[PDB]
Amino acid sequence: TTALVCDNGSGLVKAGFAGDDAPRAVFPSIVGRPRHQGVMVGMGQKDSYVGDEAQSKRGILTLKYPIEHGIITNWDDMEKIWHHTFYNELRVAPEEHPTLLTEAPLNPKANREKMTQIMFETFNVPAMYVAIQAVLSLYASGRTTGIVLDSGDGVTHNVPIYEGYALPHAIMRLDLAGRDLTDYLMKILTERGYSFVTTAEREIVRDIKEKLCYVALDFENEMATAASSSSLEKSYELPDGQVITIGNERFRCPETLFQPSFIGMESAGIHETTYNSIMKCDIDIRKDLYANNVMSGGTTMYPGIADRMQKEITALAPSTMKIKIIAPPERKYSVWIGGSILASLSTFQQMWITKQEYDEAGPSIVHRKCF
Amino acid sequence: TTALVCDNGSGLVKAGFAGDDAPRAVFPSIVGRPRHQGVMVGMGQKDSYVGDEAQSKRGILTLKYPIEHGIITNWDDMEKIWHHTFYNELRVAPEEHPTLLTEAPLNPKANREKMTQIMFETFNVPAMYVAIQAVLSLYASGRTTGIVLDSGDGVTHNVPIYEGYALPHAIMRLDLAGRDLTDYLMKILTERGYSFVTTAEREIVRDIKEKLCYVALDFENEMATAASSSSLEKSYELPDGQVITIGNERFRCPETLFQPSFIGMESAGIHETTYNSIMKCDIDIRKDLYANNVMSGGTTMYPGIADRMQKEITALAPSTMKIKIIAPPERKYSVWIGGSILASLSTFQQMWITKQEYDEAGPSIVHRKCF
Amino acid sequence: TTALVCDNGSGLVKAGFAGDDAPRAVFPSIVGRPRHQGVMVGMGQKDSYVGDEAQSKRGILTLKYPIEHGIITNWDDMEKIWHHTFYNELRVAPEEHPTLLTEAPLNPKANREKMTQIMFETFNVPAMYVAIQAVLSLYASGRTTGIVLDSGDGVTHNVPIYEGYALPHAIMRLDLAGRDLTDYLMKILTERGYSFVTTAEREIVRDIKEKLCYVALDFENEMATAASSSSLEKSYELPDGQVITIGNERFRCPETLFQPSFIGMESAGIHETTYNSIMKCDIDIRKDLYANNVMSGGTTMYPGIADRMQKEITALAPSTMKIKIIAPPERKYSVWIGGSILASLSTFQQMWITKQEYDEAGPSIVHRKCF
Amino acid sequence: TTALVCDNGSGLVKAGFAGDDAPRAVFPSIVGRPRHQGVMVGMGQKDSYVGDEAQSKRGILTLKYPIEHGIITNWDDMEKIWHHTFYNELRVAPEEHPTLLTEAPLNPKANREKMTQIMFETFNVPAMYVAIQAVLSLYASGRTTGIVLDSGDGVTHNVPIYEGYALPHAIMRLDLAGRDLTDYLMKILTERGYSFVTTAEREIVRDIKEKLCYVALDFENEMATAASSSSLEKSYELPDGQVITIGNERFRCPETLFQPSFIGMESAGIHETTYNSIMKCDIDIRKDLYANNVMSGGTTMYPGIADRMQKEITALAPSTMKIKIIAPPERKYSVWIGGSILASLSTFQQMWITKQEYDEAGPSIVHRKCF
Amino acid sequence: TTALVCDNGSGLVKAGFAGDDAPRAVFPSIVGRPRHQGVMVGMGQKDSYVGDEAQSKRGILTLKYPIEHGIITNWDDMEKIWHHTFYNELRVAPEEHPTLLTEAPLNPKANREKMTQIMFETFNVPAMYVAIQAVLSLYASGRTTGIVLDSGDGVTHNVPIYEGYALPHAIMRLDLAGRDLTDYLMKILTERGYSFVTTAEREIVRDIKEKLCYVALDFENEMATAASSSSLEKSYELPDGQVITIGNERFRCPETLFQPSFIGMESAGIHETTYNSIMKCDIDIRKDLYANNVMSGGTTMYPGIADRMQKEITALAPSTMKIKIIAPPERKYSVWIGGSILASLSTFQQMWITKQEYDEAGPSIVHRKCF
Ligand SMILES: C/C1=C\CC[C@H](C)OC(=O)C[C@H](c2ccc(O)cc2)NC(=O)[C@@H](Cc2c[nH]c3ccccc23)N(C)C(=O)[C@H](CCCCN)NC(=O)[C@@H](C)C1
Ligand SMILES: Nc1ncnc2c1ncn2[C@@H]1O[C@H](COP(=O)(O)OP(=O)(O)O)[C@@H](O)[C@H]1O
Ligand SMILES: Nc1ncnc2c1ncn2[C@@H]1O[C@H](COP(=O)(O)OP(=O)(O)O)[C@@H](O)[C@H]1O
Ligand SMILES: Nc1ncnc2c1ncn2[C@@H]1O[C@H](COP(=O)(O)OP(=O)(O)O)[C@@H](O)[C@H]1O
Ligand SMILES: Nc1ncnc2c1ncn2[C@@H]1O[C@H](COP(=O)(O)OP(=O)(O)O)[C@@H](O)[C@H]1O
Ligand SMILES: Nc1ncnc2c1ncn2[C@@H]1O[C@H](COP(=O)(O)OP(=O)(O)O)[C@@H](O)[C@H]1O
Ligand SMILES: [Mg+2]
Ligand SMILES: [Mg+2]
Ligand SMILES: [Mg+2]
Ligand SMILES: [Mg+2]
Ligand SMILES: [Mg+2]
């Protein structure tokens, strides 16, 4: 009846109904399991916990993320998350509504085929569609032209679109993502003696990162400043009441997005990737993409990231070029919002893969681009 | 009611109404189509763009010119251009006005027959006439005697007229035209490392040529000068803000009109062709044609071309002969203007091919020269 | 009222009024027609040009002479010339004045009968008379005795008159005339590589002949001189500014009047014809004719022709005989002048053929010699 | 020892030995030069090619004909052709044999004088003679009376001979020749869209003309037929395997010999020129020339030309006159054959210009007509 | 003493001595540098590795190619490669032997001038010459006529030569080359989940391409076959012992040479470019070029490419034309071999730029084409 929109990406699950201005179900893509003993199954015990349950009880659980780098690697756990979203968080049977799913570009074909098969079997979704997240992000901004940098937990990617036409030959993807920045911060923090090694401890570091990290406009000057000034230090109170101090780790962590070499990658920084996607585009496109760089995804939420990219692109770009970065307060939910918009359009109504079409065509139908 | 005048030649379309001192609809003879993907037809997308639309959106389009060397080669695209001129640019139904068309001399008979059939079927023009462009150019100058050198995008041609009588046995045509000079410049520029290989890039080179090229009065001295002096270099800013420098390419390009051998042709230069057309004319005609060389067409707009031909013809001509070149600021539109003049004459009123005459006589009527 | 006098002979038309000391209308007997295309009659075009118009526009016209060897061969064109003389050059209606016409002797009777009928029908001349050109030439000289050699464009002829009495049994006519000398020069000039083959080119050769040719007093010595000396060469500038050099062709052309064998004729030279006309005359006449050789007509204008004949006749004549050649600066117009004189005489007033006499007698009246 | 006979005329060179029934060396009068680049002279490259070499390699060469309208215009290239004939094709040193050359009538005197000087200097021919081509053509036919129409590549000419006596006052020459018919066909063919503009392309058109063109007996009926019937169309396969269709161009091309006005000439057609040469001849000659019209030269090879002239002359001629055209299968070589015959005669032995006579008399000896 | 021949093109360096039947030094044009840390310079560590060293140690190195699209972009690294070739691989001082270098056509003039300056300064080569690679490739085949398609790592180009004469106006160049096919395969392979993103991983993909890819004769049928048959799949073992399966990626990669649109280019496929170069050549050249299509360069080594072009050209060509493709087992080394042949010729001995000529003339001497 009303399409469900479900941006079930790496790290965080975001779902709600088409026409909503926000997801209704927002929770971690985590399936947790008891760590210290077996499960006393003759008692009212559980074998696994999902999302918020997994976080509240994390002190006794091993926590796994079924999606790594945008790819579902653990299908049994992924079914548990989808089940939880439909029955515990949104509380809507899948048989009642068509579902719009999202995916990062350049993923294995099998990822879509298996995801489609599940939505058409364990759940029985009347019809479905898998959209590219960057495309949806541009719909959310309202622009028809620009280069969407969708930077999430598992994948960072760039998809240029010109006046509504996709430019598929200039799509770029990096593995560097929020998950790595978090892993890097766990490493950086050992320098001050704070050792976070368990999975629950990883979640604490994720929370530290979200509250304290920022992008330095000038990395070297910020380092020099941190070296002598206590003004860049902030405290954080841990779940058990202990207090720790975070100093230059606050900007050394997100700096890796500009300098991937900090964690051993050959990858270009996010401003170089954006620039290169622009340079692979036709010369008569480039000026419009320079003026329309659209950021979305959770890692774009670091304070100052939009200004740091404005500076870095301007440095690489011609001096007479207009450089503009669009970075709304809604970025974290931009892909979901774009999904809500797309699902409600009258043209998107005719491009749903229906159950009947799926049964006759088989899994390859998921790669249909008839639009 | 009022004849339409439409010089729809190679490269650029020029149309307006008889009695106007200028075309109202001036746009490229280009039909563009999306290059990087198919067309998402369930969305508000287009399959093709025409003229100005094709130029504004050229960064994602393959651009084709339906007319090559004065010959329509792509009739489906030609119908789209004519449609665009009548309905989008002039916004006048063809059923309301007779139409004057133009053509280069020595074209295949089929070109006129097909063009006539379309004007009498897809559009339903009450009456029409196809004029030779060089003849119209002479009408625009106001002279009754002279040798019109009409040099456009696809054809360069010479048509001598003496005191109102055509001299059809001395008509000359070259394939060398503005399109080749542009193609040559794309090649010349690789010497400085600027590689223009796509169709949109061809349009950039065309713009470079129009703004920076000129005819050297003395080619060899201009080359020697360019070799040591920066004074002949000019910059050009590209659509993406990058800047390039053009040096002796500024005069090596148009020099090909005087030296066709630069692109491999056996053709005589434009001053030799003009001279030879004069020499094939009766000895008692020659002195009047020498004194009345009329230039028209877009490639005659290169700065200094009139002076270079004045020098070259004078060198070939008898020393006691008056050599004079007429080259108005309106040359680019001379053929169109001549069409406006002809269409408004009371004698040209009786020589229109009407729909009824066409239906009874068939396509061969287009070759009628009853005047 | 005042008789018109019209020596409309081969090549050149000369007309004016009786009592005038010169023609007022002097123009070529040429009717020209467009050569390269048909006539665009819906435009302000002409089908034919006459006299001076034909010469000014000759580069695009085929030029015909209606009179060949003194005989009108093209009557339609002849009417156009007469029309032009009366209405465009003299601008006098034929109905207002009687007309004196001239004719070469020994012409077909039909030539006079048709000429008379036209003057009495297309034009309505009140009265007319056809005179022999040689007789008029003698009137112009003022002599009553002598042998008039009238040498024009189409006919060369000799008419002896003794003390006012004609001697009709000694009249001689040659076809060799200025037209042949001109045709011969066109042939001679191919030796230096100057090929004149079109009708307009014939007119150029005629002009070359008129300006450069002369009669050698001693042909063989002049040839021997030309063989080693550049002093006999003269340049001529052509209508298109090209320059050519004429050498011994300057005297080889007019020599044909003394040696007709140069063009294949059996005819005697002009000095032999003059001599023979004298020898056919009575022995008591001969001495007076020898002393009164009167030259007239355009070909007598070659410099030195009077001296060459003085020498040639003296060589054929008895050594005790007085040989005298009369050759006025007015020779070109002598026949016309004689016509002016005759038309003004009181005795010539009573010998006009009137319209009434013509209508009653018919065309044979033109042969009336009642004097 | 044995005279060489060399009809080195416009277009095609024909040479062999006196007494032969055919030339041994037959090749185009063409000197070709590389077109697209300079010559890499340090490599085994050539600067120019002659005759067959020029044709085989024509795709990269500019091809020039040293003889235009029967006149040698390029003496350096003419020496190369003569050299090639003597040393590469016949392989006979000029010092060993006297040489008989031919020439069109009414050529510049300088043409013979320069040709003679070369044969007496660059080559050292023991003795030579220059014959008129039409005279030789009559010898080849075996007749002593008739009017030889020699129609080649550069000159069309008529030379009447009566019972062995030449009639030099009735010799006519036209510029219209095979070269113009070929140039006209290149123009006609643009009507079907086949544009031949390079020199090698001219050679293709020449080949098309030779294989497909014919003379219509009734031009107007043949045009009417071509208008509705495919039976007059023939295909031609081009050097690159492409195929073109030639329709009424097959007879419109050679028709120009009967209607020179098709290419802008005032010239009479070939049947009118033949007729006029007859009419300039004595009335007691005319009947024998009418019965002996002899055709020779390559343009007389068009199928049906003899029948078309039979019809046209008969139409102009008196109805009781016998009209006969002689047109042997050997016409193409008739002049050469006549040269072989003349060179072998015992009387022609005493009229050779020897080297000694030349050195003492100088170049003017070439005009000797002592026979 | 013995010229060195060095085809130091994009991707792979090939060098040896003139007269050798093969290069002696064959190694990648790669300069590698440590990736994960700085260089511990107080220890026996290196800052950079070249060629084979760079490949053996690639797991810790960033690898750069100094030549992109045939253009040297990194001159410091290029000097390191040249140094390595002369001193480590061939072990011959440059001062002892003249050197023959090669270059792709239509490169920036600066590329030759800088390359020449280095060979004349950092190394001190007695004399040098820069040859076009396609020309050398034709020498290697032994043919004097044909169209050399040299398809390497950075440039694909077509150079027609006719009977030893170059045809410089029909030279075509594409950017599409082996480097792009490799980049495309890295992208295609993400579909099966194999993500290759680092530079060393690029080298693995290059190796996969070289061992498994082929050209489908019928692309569509090969795709249809791959869709149902495991017979087109091949395994590949990775450096760490893991095994991957490559399916239709085996022919989708090289297909881009026939369909450049697969990677977003407007370029014509290689069979269309070859065809168009032929069509720009003179009609009398075309048949010989069709019969002599010569392939060279590493990308021509894909199995089946010669047969695919035979089919594609035949489809575009006239049906009566002979189409022949020459594709020797030595193609990979054809340019080098041609260099060995040229360097050993006695004519090429006189066209070397010597040190003295260079010092006096300056860098512009490198553009000398005196041959
Ligand atoms: C036999 C021959 C050409 C025909 C090739 C093929 C078998 O037939 C066609 O395809 C016809 C087809 C056709 C097209 C449209 C139509 O309404 C009706 C007909 N013509 C074209 O495209 C013409 C177009 C053209 C260019 N300037 C012209 C000048 C006058 C007339 C035509 C042209 N074009 C490419 C050629 O002539 C080319 C190249 C000329 C430029 C060199 N500087 N010339 C040749 O190869 C030569 C050997 C001649
Ligand atoms: N304020 C913030 N600052 C920095 N990172 C953030 C912030 N909020 C969320 N993130 C990071 O964003 C990622 C999750 O956001 P999201 O883009 O929704 O992920 P995904 O789209 O992969 O589900 C995590 O890596 C998380 O740490
Ligand atoms: N200022 C200029 N200098 C040189 N070339 C010009 C200029 N303006 C236009 N042109 C050339 O003229 C051609 C188009 O002019 P136009 O004569 O109208 O073409 P067409 O008549 O074929 O439509 C193009 O080749 C264009 O580059
Ligand atoms: N100065 C001149 N020298 C030689 N011939 C002349 C000269 N002037 C005129 N003629 C010739 O005279 C002829 C025309 O003179 P004219 O006697 O009036 O002819 P017609 O009486 O036949 O009209 C032409 O042949 C012309 O070339
Ligand atoms: N079969 C033929 N049909 C028509 N023209 C021909 C034929 N054969 C040759 N020609 C033409 O004849 C001319 C060459 O023949 P030829 O008389 O020997 O020339 P020339 O005598 O000037 O050397 C060329 O114009 C050629 O096209
Ligand atoms: N067997 C093969 N199949 C396909 N491509 C190959 C093969 N061998 C080499 N190549 C490709 O050829 C290129 C290098 O060959 P080469 O022509 O020598 O390059 P270059 O001339 O640019 O140095 C690389 O792109 C490489 O992948
Ligand atoms: Mg996401
Ligand atoms: Mg135009
Ligand atoms: Mg007179
Ligand atoms: Mg001949
Ligand atoms: Mg190479």
Written as one string, the DSSP assignment of D338-350 is: HHHHHHT-TTGGG
Distance CA B130, CA B153 (A): 19
Q: What is the DSSP string of E198-216?
A: SHHHHHHHHHHHHHH----
User: CB of C167 within 8 A of CB of C175?
Assistant: no
Q: What is the C-alpha to C-alpha distance for residues D190 and D181, in angstroms, rounded to an integer?
A: 15
- CA dist B146 and D208 (Å) reads 35
What is the distance between the alpha carbons of residues D122 and C208, in angstroms, rounded to a whole number? Answer: 39
Task: Report A:241-270 residues touching E (Cβ under 8 A).
Answer: 264, 266-267
Q: SS3 of E92, please?
A: coil
Q: In terms of domains, do E146 and E73 share one?
A: no
* Structure's resolution in angstroms: 3.1
Check whether residue C155 and residue C278 sit in a common domain. yes
Residue C17 bridge partners (DSSP): C4
Provide the pairing of β-strand B31-34 with B49-50. Answer: antiparallel
Task: Report the distance separating Cα B31 and Cα C346, nearest Å.
Answer: 91
Integer Cα distance of C91 and C25 in angstroms: 10
Residue D186 corresponds to which tokens in the numbers above?
A: 């290149």
Residues A157 and A185 in one domain: no
Q: Whose CA is nearest to atom 17 of ligand 6?
A: E298
Does the distance separating the beta carbons of A281 and B36 come in below 8 Å?
Answer: no
Pairing of strands A146-151, A156-162: antiparallel
For residue D348, give the CATH number of its domain. 3.30.420.40
- Give Dmax over CA atoms of chain C in angstroms: 73
Write down the H helix ranges in D249-363.
249-252, 270-279, 283-290, 305-316, 334-343, 355-361
Structure tokens that stand for E263 in this block: 């990677």
Greatest C-alpha distance within chain D: 73
E360 — phi, psi (to 5°)? -75, -40
Residues of A in contact with B237 (CB under 8 A): 320
Q: Are A254 and A358 in a shared domain?
A: no
The pair of structure tokens assigned to D342 is 């003349």
Judging contact as 3 or more Cβ pairs under 8 Å, the answer for E and D is yes
How many residues are recorded in chain C?
371
Query: Would you call C362 helix, strand, or coil by DSSP?
Result: coil
B138 touches C: beta carbon within 8 Å: no
* Torsion on CA atoms B132, B138, B142, B145, rounded to nearest 10: -120
If one counts every other C-beta atom within 10 angstroms of the C-beta of residue A133, the result is: 26
Structure tokens at D163: 């019972």
Q: Among D251, D265, D282, which Cα is nearest to D162's?
A: D282
Q: Name the residue facing B284 among C37, C59, C237 (closest C-beta).
A: C59
| Contact status, residue E271 vs residue E259, Cβ threshold 8 Å | no
Report d(CA D153, CA D65) in Å as an integer: 11
Q: If DSSP codes are grouped into helix, strand and coil, which group holds residue C320?
A: coil
Residues A143 and A56 in one domain: no
**Three-class secondary structure of residue A62 per DSSP:** strand
Paired tokens of B49: 């763009």
- DSSP E strands in chain B: the ranges are 4-8, 12-17, 25-28, 31-34, 49-50, 61-64, 67-68, 71-72, 99-103, 127-132, 146-151, 156-162, 165-166, 172-174, 234-237, 243-246, 293-296, 325-326, 353-354
The one-letter amino acid at B58: R
Q: Are residues E278 and E349 in the same domain?
A: no
- CATH number of the structural domain spanning residue E201: 3.90.640.10
Q: Which residues of D touch C193 (CB under 8 A)?
A: 71, 108, 110
CA angle B260, B266, B271 (to 5 degrees): 50
Check if C59 contacts B (Cβ < 8 Å).
Answer: yes
Could you tell me the two tokens for B105? 């001399």
Return the DSSP state at D329: T
DSSP for residue A169: G
Q: How far apart are CA E355 and CA E371, in angstroms?
A: 18
D104 and D17, same structural domain? yes
DSSP annotation of D126: S
- Structure tokens, E211: 């061992």
Which CATH number characterizes residue D53's domain?
Answer: 2.30.36.70
B193 has a chain A CB within 8 A of its CB: no
Which tokens in the block code for residue A234? 């902030």
Nearest to C42 among B281, B283, B351 (CB): B351
3-state secondary structure C124-179: CCCEEEEEEHHHHHHHHHCCCCEEEEEECCCCEEEEEEECCEECHHHCEEECCCHH
Closest E-chain CA to B201:
E266
SS percent in chain A: helix, strand, coil, step 5: 45, 20, 35
Contact, C167 vs C364, CB < 8 A?
no
Q: How many Cα atoms sit within 13 Å of E133 on the Cβ side?
A: 33
| Length in residues, chain A | 371
Q: Are the C-beta atoms of residues E298 and E12 closer than 8 Å to each other?
A: yes
- Cα angle for residues C264, C270, C271 (degrees, 5° grid): 125
Q: Would you call C116 helix, strand, or coil by DSSP?
A: helix
**B212 Cβ partners below 8 Å, 6+ apart?**
B234, B236, B246, B250
Q: Token pair of B169, please?
A: 């046995």
Output the six-digit token pair for E220.
Answer: 């569509």
How many other C-beta atoms are found inside a 10 Å radius of the C-beta of residue A362? 12
Q: Are A106 and E190 in contact (CB under 8 A)?
A: yes
Residue C251 is encoded by which pair of tokens?
């005297």
Q: Tokens 């300064």 belong to which residue?
A: E121
E255 within 8 A of E215, measured Cβ to Cβ: yes
Confirm if A118 and A8 have CB atoms less than 8 A apart: no
Q: Give the nearest partner residue to B108 out of D35, D191, D197, using CB atoms.
A: D191
Taking an 8 Å cut-off on Cβ atoms, the answer to whether E109 and B191 are in contact is yes
Distance of alpha carbon A245 from alpha carbon A231, whole angstroms? 12
Domain boundary among the residues D225, D248, D263 is at D263
| Beta strands B234-237; B99-103: pairing state | unpaired
- Report CB contact under 8 Å: C187, D109: no
| Residue owning the nearest CA to atom 5 of ligand 4 | C299
Tell me the backbone φ, ψ of residue C321, rounded to 5 degrees: -85, 140
Q: Residue E145's CB: how many other CB atoms inside 10 A?
A: 17
Structure-token pair, residue B267: 């053709």
Tokens of A87: 């029955």
Query: Which of C60, C62, C184, C197 should be substituted to probe chain D, the one whose Cβ sees the most D Cβ atoms within 10 Å?
Result: C197
Q: Could you tell me the CA-to-CA distances from E359 to A90, E116, E119 in Å, in that order?
A: 82, 11, 12
Could you tell me which residues come within 8 angstroms of residue C249 by beta carbon, excluding any fewer than 6 positions away?
C185, C188, C189, C191, C192
Statement to judge: residues C120 and C85 lie in one domain: yes
State the residue range of the domain holding D140: 132-177+267-328
Nearby residues of B199 by Cβ (< 8 Å), 6 or more positions away: B58, B61, B62, B63, B64, E266
Nearest to B32 by CA among E266, D259, E169, D147: E266
Could you tell me which residues are beta bridge partners of residue B147?
A: B160, B293
Q: CA-CA distances (angstroms) from residue E39 to A115, D332, E35, E49, E54?
A: 47, 89, 9, 13, 15
Q: Say how many CA atoms lie within 13 Å of D286 toward its Cβ.
A: 15
Give the pair of three-digit tokens for residue D73.
Answer: 């215009």
Measured from the Cα of B155, ligand 1's closest atom is: 27
Our mutation pick for probing the ligand 2 site, out of A78, A182, A332, A335, counting the most ligand atoms within 8 A of Cβ, is A332
Q: Are residues C188 and C213 in the same domain?
A: yes
Domains held by chain D: number: 4
Interaxial angle between packed helices B283-290 and C199-212, expressed in degrees from 0 to 180 and rounded to the nearest 10:
90
CA separation for the pair B22, B9 (Å, rounded): 16
Angle between helices C178-188 and C199-212 (to 10 degrees): 100
From the CA of E266, how many Å to the nearest CA of chain D?
Answer: 28
Residues D331, D301: Cα–Cα separation, whole Å:
7
Torsion of CA B10, B12, B18, B19, to 10 degrees: -130
C55 in the same domain as C41: yes
Cα distance between residue B295 and residue A331, in whole Å: 62
3-state secondary structure B250-318: HHHCHHHHCCHHHHCCCCCCHHHHHHHHHHCCCHHHHHHHHCCEEEECHHHHCCCHHHHHHHHHHHHCC
Residues B12 and B142 in one domain: no
Say whether D201 sits in a helix, a strand or coil: helix
Nearby residues of D11 by Cβ (< 8 Å), 6 or more positions away:
D28, D29, D65, D67, D152, D153, D154, D178, D179, D298
Q: Which helix (H) or strand (E) holds B214?
A: none
Chains within contact range of chain E (3+ C-beta pairs < 8 Å): A, B, D
What lies within 8 Å, CB to CB, of C35 at 6+ separation is: C60, C61, C62, D264, D266
Do residues D221 and D124 both lie within one domain? no
Solved using: cryo-EM
Q: Is the CB of A302 under 6 A from ligand 2?
A: yes
**Alpha helix ranges (H) inside B146-263:** 178-188, 199-212, 219-228, 249-252
